[PDB]
């Protein structure tokens, strides 16, 4: 295994180092506004060395943006695909590339058999070529790598089954900045090449000057280069025709033949295209070839890529004709005029890359190596696209909830083969496709119109219901004696209980377990643990009495804590935000211990008085002018006091101190240690009153944030043996710090209300001497070093926080893990900050045509880990990566993949068993079974199950290793007949494994395996 910590890779271009050296000046470059006047030597190409030009027709089809997926399909995409089929069928030399398989599958399934056969023929013959082949072209900033892989697999599995092709070239022309997680996944999925477009204009200028727009993109920790993927970065401001033929858009616009008038389009540079004729073709070719030769100067081979397309293009038959015929007249002239020394033709993306590599193998070019990312993007001036790291945060959080539900449903149902009548494959395909759709770069990014966001939300709600159905049917089968198991596949044997989604204060969605002497004495509950190691976690349920005790199925008592159910209300009469307690529902909390990838059953029983093994939390309301808070049968009366500082400690965990406003002020790790200053603060950013306005995409603050005025907020303190917490009702946020014995959990119920042109940020202030360095993750896969640059504006220093961020000095680190992707930064030494929500009245001029005024309450979740790191073996000062500690990684897993909780719905569960998975190996803590998916339906004689195994890399800080068993996923199911290592999409077998054993993977590596069973 390569060492991912101690060896700094030697690359030609390292983006953090490049950023430190670049000046980012926004100077007027002439017709190429963000470049320079390109010069070329006419003698470079000649009879023996021609410029080969591939014009690649394309149509960018967003799966929802300004219209829903179905609206665009009916109004635009079905016509584009129908006319592409007709035009390509009738014109053998014409080509076209297609990226979004969600639309292609929606079209293909509605085609009659004759047309399906025609479509297969134009794909098999190379006229229509799929690029990437994912369900969507995903966002790369907020998306979790697991979902990037899910959507890639959904599209490529469809293509392999119906079109018999698997793309090896990727096309990503629209995500708003680019992540190295893409080449990581693509290279492990059989890809050989990829293309990107939206990178900072200063980066395009810098790389173009050095002819470094094509590079071998490797991961930041990869010393050897085995992760490298050839990448082509486009050079110009857009993927539209005016910015793809060459440097001067006023010229290139004249070669978009859809802009002459009858189509409702024109050239903003005020010179229109003119139909090519024998009388103007020589002058028109002179102009076009000059643009091509200038673009070719920015690259190293004699093969040039000229994309020809835009949003929802190639819709009308007349458009296909006007583009094709005019370009064919130009090719016939150009290719017959020896003085140009050019051979131009329509081509596909793969044809371009194959020709580039032929040139490379002939020794005509060598390419530079590069590591790093391409965030934060700016397309012009100071317009940095860091707003979408937070926009529509409710749906960003929903993404992570559904991510976990899809994994748990696929894993729980994989253990058995299911009859078709159970509809398991049907529900899982629906859930995978809705979650995959939301990965679109106008989905999770929060950049779609309001009614489109509603459509994505409704699709994800249906997907969550599908996952619940599959999970509860699977639990009933896994934990019932087989000769008693009697399923009705439409029945709800269990209901899921989720304490953090939608969340208290967001939706009253949780069911209360109703117990009573005259109705039902007890109730079975079951926890599922999707992670491959034994895990304990506190779990809570609502119950109708405070006198409840817990037992396991061997009837052993389990220690439990009962607390009240508190709900916060913005009281419009008293004008205060304060909590109300229930006098008939209570929370019972206990530690569940669950096997690796397994299940554990417990029983909740009512008694007429306080049970021996259940304790009750005390509650203290700190506020001036208190009023009583009765809690029914709850045995401890609520206490009151004026606001004051308070300190709490659960178990042997840290001691946390809080200000009189209910906000953390310090953390003391052990009995003797210092109370380390760590303070939470909420602030607000505004919008500029002149100049460019923030919107869904852009963050354009009117200066540093201002503190939210807190008034004298009401603070609720709950102190229990198993769980304690401090909650405070602040303007727009009920902020809660929860302690269970380790790093605290933070929950914010964020309701920005009607505060227009406001972005609410949560900041942590410490005295850690971090300087200008901080770390943020990329897609939940890796942590990258960031350097705050005071030569760039505030919004350029914001980065995506898809799952966590940290600051550190020689001795101390503070890590904030998140349960949802949000934007954040470290704007000063010792600080971390993360945006909670943003409400913006204005459109930001990127085509959305609206502000962001559809905010709704969202419950954000976090874990806050303060640690000593002076003993940790960390990368050297020049290494571009960082790595979590064991505690921080476990805290992130507690947010993203918590235990699932199931409540038995009927009165009696006949044949119930106490546990499933007790014999499953408990793997080392850095290893995860990211995906477990049965790949065959029940009629297949040879069943196949796919696994994606990922090992992260955790710092070595002095804790002895201990235990753990080797995990061989190929032997998790019985009767294994074969084990194969495959691409990550499961579509190609790469290695037949000796002894049917699937080896574990190295740190930072991900592998896929398929076991076959007879
Ligand atoms: O013409 S528009 O639609 O206003 O904007 C463009 C060219 O002007 C963009 O390239 C359309 S892209 C399409 C959509 O996926 C992105 O949200 C948009 C960000 O701007
Ligand atoms: C699928 O494509 C392969 C080549 O990639 C070809 O040999 C095969 O016949 C095609 N159809 C089948 C058999 O699946
Ligand atoms: Zn797009």
UniProtKB/Swiss-Prot annotation:
GO BP terms, alphabetized: encapsulation of foreign target; mannose metabolic process; N-glycan processing; protein glycosylation; rhodopsin biosynthetic process
Protein's membrane topology: Single-pass type II membrane protein
Entry keyword annotation includes Transmembrane helix: yes
Family annotation (SMART domains): Alpha-mann_mid
Entry's localization field: Golgi apparatus membrane
Binding site residues for Zn(2+): 60, 62, 174, 441
Family named by the database record: Belongs to the glycosyl hydrolase 38 family.
UniProt pathway annotation: Protein modification; protein glycosylation
Cofactor, free-text remark: Binds 1 zinc ion per subunit.
Protein species of origin: Drosophila melanogaster
Function noted in UniProt: Catalyzes the first committed step in the biosynthesis of complex N-glycans. It controls conversion of high mannose to complex N-glycans; the final hydrolytic step in the N-glycan maturation pathway.
Gene name of the record: alpha-Man-IIa
One GO MF term: mannosyl-oligosaccharide 1,3-1,6-alpha-mannosidase activity
Reaction catalyzed: N(4)-{beta-D-GlcNAc-(1->2)-alpha-D-Man-(1->3)-[alpha-D-Man-(1->3)-[alpha-D-Man-(1->6)]-alpha-D-Man-(1->6)]-beta-D-Man-(1->4)-beta-D-GlcNAc-(1->4)-beta-D-GlcNAc}-L-asparaginyl-[protein] + 2 H2O = 2 alpha-D-mannopyranose + an N(4)-{beta-D-GlcNAc-(1->2)-alpha-D-Man-(1->3)-[alpha-D-Man-(1->6)]-beta-D-Man-(1->4)-beta-D-GlcNAc-(1->4)-beta-D-GlcNAc}-L-asparaginyl-[protein]
Name of the top EC class for this enzyme: hydrolase
Lumenal topological intervals: 1-1014
Keyword annotations: Disulfide bond, Glycosidase, Golgi apparatus, Hydrolase, Membrane, Metal-binding, Signal-anchor, Transmembrane, Transmembrane helix, Zinc
Domain of life from the UniProt record: Eukaryota
Cofactor: Zn(2+)
EC code: 3.2.1.114
Protein name per the record: Alpha-mannosidase 2
Active site (UniProt): 174
Cellular component annotations (GO), alphabetically ordered: endoplasmic reticulum; Golgi membrane; Golgi stack
Pfam family, any one: Glyco_hydro_38C
Upregulating conditions: Inhibited by swainsonine and by copper sulfate.
